[PDB]
């Protein structure tokens, strides 16, 4: 869930240099199609990078398309192109923990209304008198 304060002083060192290292070190393998070649074709830019409190999950956000079908299609590849990624990043000792990436869709269509209530109910009354 959460914990709240930051507390100690590296708590912030650990965030920034993991948000930072992993958004350096992705990028980065996105630069060379020797390993991700489908991935290069594609020519993905990574634009920003979520890291959890608990250092448990890191979510990262690509730029998308408008469209769907390609999202999907991309997202499926380049998901399928994380597992062995996260293992071409561990190479650098520097990093305590790795934790498993998750790539997530800027533009993530979501469409929730909150209504509940359909009805027309107020108390007024303009009349003068």
Aim: aromatic share 4%; net charge negative; hydrophobic share 40%.
């Amino acid at each position: 869930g959460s914990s709240g304060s930051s507390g100690r002083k590296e708590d912030h060192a650990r965030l920034r240099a993991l948000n930072g290292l992993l958004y350096k070190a992705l990028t980065d393998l996105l630069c060379t199609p020797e390993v991700s070649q489908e991935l290069y074709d594609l020519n993905v830019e990574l634009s920003k990078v979520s890291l959890t409190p608990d250092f448990s999950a890191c979510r990262a956000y690509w730029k998308t398309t408008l469209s769907a079908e390609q999202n999907a299609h991309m997202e499926a590849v380049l998901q399928r192109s994380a597992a062995h990624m996260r293992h071409l990043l561990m190479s650098q000792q520097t990093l305590r923990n790795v934790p498993p990436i998750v790539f997530v869709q800027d533009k993530g269509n979501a469409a929730l209304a909150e209504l509940d209530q359909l009805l027309a109910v107020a108390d007024s009354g303009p009349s003068s008198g």
